[PDB]
Amino acid sequence: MNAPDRFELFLLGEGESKLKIDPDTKAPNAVVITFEKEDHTLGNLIRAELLNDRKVLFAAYKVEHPFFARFKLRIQTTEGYDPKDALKNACNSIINKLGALKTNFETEWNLQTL
Amino acid sequence: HSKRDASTPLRSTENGIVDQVLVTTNQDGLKFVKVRVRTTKIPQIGDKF
Amino acid sequence: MIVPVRCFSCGKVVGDKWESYLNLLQEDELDEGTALSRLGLKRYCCRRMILTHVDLIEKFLRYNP
Amino acid sequence: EEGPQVKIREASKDNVDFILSNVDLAMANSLRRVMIAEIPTLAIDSVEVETNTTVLADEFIAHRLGLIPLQSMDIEQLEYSRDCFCEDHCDKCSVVLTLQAFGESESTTNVYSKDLVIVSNLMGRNIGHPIIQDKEGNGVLICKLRKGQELKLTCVAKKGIAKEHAKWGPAAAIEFEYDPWNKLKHTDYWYEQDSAKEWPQSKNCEYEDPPNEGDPFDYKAQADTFYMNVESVGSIPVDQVVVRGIDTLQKKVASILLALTQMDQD
Amino acid sequence: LKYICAECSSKLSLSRTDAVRCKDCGHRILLKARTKRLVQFEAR
Ligand SMILES: [Zn+2]
Ligand SMILES: [Zn+2]
Ligand SMILES: [Zn+2]
């Protein structure tokens, strides 16, 4: 009746951009990025990978409401270090780890029976 | 305009599919009809359990 | 009605295991637990899904229309 | 390789029991989530009913058809109907399979998933074929016809995500457990007398070292070893379930990276 | 249009000014036949 379409969980609406980067007014050298059509699956991973970078002061994600598939990610890095680069490094690290994991799982799969 | 309308409308808030239509004369020889409409209801936010 | 195709909880297919279950009950003369075990229903959600089901379609087919 | 490590403990057509080593908790969890939901699969999305004199309702049967596991091997060279430049659907996006059943014998005439017949042109791709893990080779019991009851319909199956509907779910139950000895103390066990005697001991306890009472609490330890068991439904092989899970997660990360690359436009 | 009797497998086609009863039966319970214009179902 008033239930929203399912594909609105992963399909970007009319005019809706994927990432919304906004300058944080609270703490200096901080940023809040709005992820659209994404849930905890991406947010938790990215946030957990941003805490590995020792040049990142703050990193936290949140889903403001379960009705809508979107989450905000706040990042604060040290001076002389753009947070977008921290996000990029985190993402690339994730991709590399997943690639290695895939390769290892494949090699380990080839050595099995039944 | 020699006829008045006495048509029956589907429920304003409901919807679905016409399941089965029955046409039969009455005991007094009156042609009357029962129309059964089917709607599948799926558990939604607010349904009582 | 009829045996549900898949388990509500996890999602394992169970609709292909109904007749096999019935046979395991009447042919091999097993109890419900073992019959459910042999069909690969280890999790009690699917085990429930088959054990709890009542096949009402067999009574429905008794009508001629 | 150089990163996370896998150790396949058990392997079969339906299940894969393995151990993830050198991994963050969030990556394991996200992998589980992706494997559960975000993985492409072919399933019946549209059902056109011509005649239906069976007991079951139309959308009832349609719903049952939706949950039928279909072959989603070459699903990656199939396309979303929302993306294809055709009208409604075609052979590049959807797979059409018919179903004609009729009561013949005096006995109950069962309608299975094997009775589904592919009509559309597969043009080489391994797709659309209904998975039959049944022993007699019947498959999913769809319906039951009496004597003169008929079920004539057509099914258009489209590529979909389990996030949109659980019928596109390539996996069933994914077993997941880290630290069987609670050495990380992520769980405060409930008890009445003895905490250890009341709570059953996990199998995975055979793969880790028990704590020493003389040893204090390790506060600097994280979660590295994860015990998983991925179970498939049949639409996609287990190895391909976890592999395409990884590929999907990685890909949707790469989409964010690409978005960051594109946001540099004036 | 056409109809179908209830307690038998017949196929009456008696339109208006006819109605009840049935061809070779005697009962006045008449159901209406299924439409030819097919309806789709989002198998969900
Ligand atoms: Zn289950
Ligand atoms: Zn197409
Ligand atoms: Zn008659």
Query: Which residues 9-28 of B have a C-beta within 8 angstroms of E?
Result: 17, 20-25
Rounded to the nearest angstrom, the distance between the alpha carbon of D122 and the centre of ligand 3 is 47
Q: How far apart are CA D129 and CA D114, in angstroms?
A: 9
* Structural domains for chain D: 1-40+167-266 (3.30.1360.10), 41-166 (2.170.120.12)
Say if CB E15 and CB E5 are below 8 A apart: no
Rounded to the nearest angstrom, the distance between the alpha carbon of D173 and the centre of ligand 1 is 7
Contact status of D166 with chain B (Cβ, < 8 Å): no
Give the other-Cβ count within 10 Å of E32's Cβ. Answer: 16
Contact status of D254 with chain A (Cβ, < 8 Å): yes
Return the HEC string of chain D: CCCCEEEEEEECCCEEEEEEECCCHHHHHHHHHHHHCCCCEEEEEEEEEEEECCCCCHHHHHHHHHCCCEEECHHHHCCCCCCCCCCCCCCCCEEEEEEEEECCCCCCEEEECCCCEECCCCCCCCEEEECCCCCCCCCCEEEEECCCCEEEEEEEEEEECCCCCHHHCCECCCEEEECCCCCCCCCCCCCCCCHHHHCCCCHHHHHCCCCCCCCCCCCCCCCCCEEEEEEECCCCCHHHHHHHHHHHHHHHHHHHHHHHHHCCCC
Domain count, chain A: 1
Q: How far apart are CA D59 and CA E37, in angstroms?
A: 16
Q: List Cα–Cα distances, A3 to A102, D38, D46, D79, E43, in angstroms.
A: 38, 21, 20, 27, 17
Cα atoms in the 13 Å half-sphere on the side-chain side of D204 = 17
Question: Does the CA dihedral D220-D224-D227-D228 come out positive or negative?
Answer: positive
**Element holding B6 (H helix, E strand):** none
Look up the CATH number of the domain holding residue A5: 3.30.1360.10
Q: List Cα–Cα distances, A14 to A11, A17, A20, D243, in angstroms.
A: 10, 9, 15, 33
Q: How far apart are CA C40 and CA D234, in angstroms?
A: 14
Say if CB A12 and CB D226 are below 8 A apart: no
Tokens for C46, please give them.
């699917």
List the one residue out of D239, D166, D234, D193 whose CA is nearest residue D18: D239
Tokens for B6, please give them.
């006495």
Tokens for D165, please give them.
């509907």
Per DSSP, the three-state class of C36 is helix
Ordered alpha helix ranges (H), A1-114: 40-50, 83-110
Give the other-Cβ count within 10 Å of A44's Cβ. Answer: 19
Q: How far apart are CA C43 and CA C36, in angstroms?
A: 10
Q: How far apart are CA D40 and CA D83, in angstroms?
A: 14
Gap positions in chain B, given as the residue before each gap (C–N > 2.5 A)?
A: none
What's the CA dihedral at D43, D47, D52, D56 to 10 degrees?
50
Q: How far apart are CA D47 and CA D66, in angstroms?
A: 9
Q: How far apart are CA C9 and CA D230, in angstroms?
A: 16
Nearest chain D alpha carbon to C19: D141
The answer for residues whose C-beta is within 8 angstroms of residue B46's C-beta and 6 or more apart is: none
Give the annotated binding-site residues of C for Zn(2+). Answer: 7, 10, 45-46
List the one residue out of D175, D172, D174, D176 whose CA is nearest residue D232: D172
Domain C1-65 fold is Arc Repressor Mutant, subunit A (1.10.10)
Q: How far apart are CA D65 and CA C38, in angstroms?
A: 26
List, as ranges, residues with CB under 5 A of the ion ligand 3.
E 5, 8, 10, 22, 25
> Which ligand is in closest contact with the Cα of C12?
1
Per DSSP, the three-state class of A103 is helix
Say if CB E6 and CB E27 are below 8 A apart: yes
**Residues of chain B contacting D, Cβ within 8 Å:** 17, 19, 38, 40
Q: List Cα–Cα distances, D136 to A89, B4, C65, D111, in angstroms.
A: 54, 64, 31, 14
Q: How far apart are CA A90 and CA A94, in angstroms?
A: 6
- Cis peptide upstream of residue A6 (ω within 30 degrees of 0): no
**CB-neighbour burial class of residue D176 (10 A; exposed 0-12, middle 13-18, buried 19+):** middle
Task: Give Rg (Cα) of chain A.
Answer: 18
Task: Give me the sheet containing D226-231, strands edge to edge.
Answer: D5-11, D15-21, D226-231, D175-178
Task: Give Rg (Cα) of chain E.
Answer: 14
Domain that residue A58 falls in = 1-114
Distance from the Cα of residue A17 to its chain's centroid:
15
- Are D and C close enough to touch, i.e. 3+ CB pairs under 8 angstroms? yes
Name E40's bridge partners.
D48
Question: Would you call B24 and E30 a contact, using CB atoms and an 8 Å cutoff?
Answer: yes
Give the other-Cβ count within 10 Å of D188's Cβ. Answer: 8
Q: How far apart are CA E19 and CA E15, in angstroms?
A: 7
Question: Can you give the length of chain C in residues?
Answer: 65
Angle at A100 between CA D180 and CA A94, to 5 degrees: 80
Kind of pairing between the strands at D15-21 and D226-231: antiparallel
Q: How far apart are CA A38 and CA A35, in angstroms?
A: 6
Say if CB D211 and CB D181 are below 8 A apart: yes
Per DSSP, the three-state class of E33 is coil
The domain defined by E1-44 carries CATH number 1.10.287.1080? no
Gap positions in chain D, given as the residue before each gap (C–N > 2.5 A)?
A: none
Residue E41 — φ and ψ, nearest 5°?
Answer: -140, 115
Q: How far apart are CA D248 and CA A4, in angstroms?
A: 25
User: Amino acid letter at D217?
Assistant: F
Q: Where are the domains of chain E?
A: 1-44
Distance from the Cα of residue D245 to its chain's centroid:
10
Task: Give Rg (Cα) of chain C.
Answer: 13
Cα(first)–Cα(last) distance of chain C, in Å?
A: 17
Say if CB A37 and CB A10 are below 8 A apart: yes
Per DSSP, the three-state class of E1 is coil
Q: How far apart are CA D118 and CA D176, in angstroms?
A: 37
Residues of A in contact with D239 (CB under 8 A): 105-106, 109
Q: How far apart are CA D72 and CA D76, in angstroms?
A: 8
Tokens for D156, please give them.
């258009």
Q: How far apart are CA C44 and CA C9, in angstroms?
A: 10
Q: Where are the domains of chain C?
A: 1-65
D90 among annotated binding-site residues:
yes
Give the other-Cβ count within 10 Å of C21's Cβ. Answer: 21
Cα atoms in the 13 Å half-sphere on the side-chain side of A100 = 15
Q: How far apart are CA D234 and CA D131, in angstroms?
A: 6
**Element holding A70 (H helix, E strand):** strand A70-77
Residue D187 — φ and ψ, nearest 5°?
Answer: -140, 125
Per DSSP, the three-state class of B37 is strand
List the one residue out of C56, C46, C41, C44 whose CA is nearest residue C2: C56
Nearest chain D alpha carbon to B19: D57
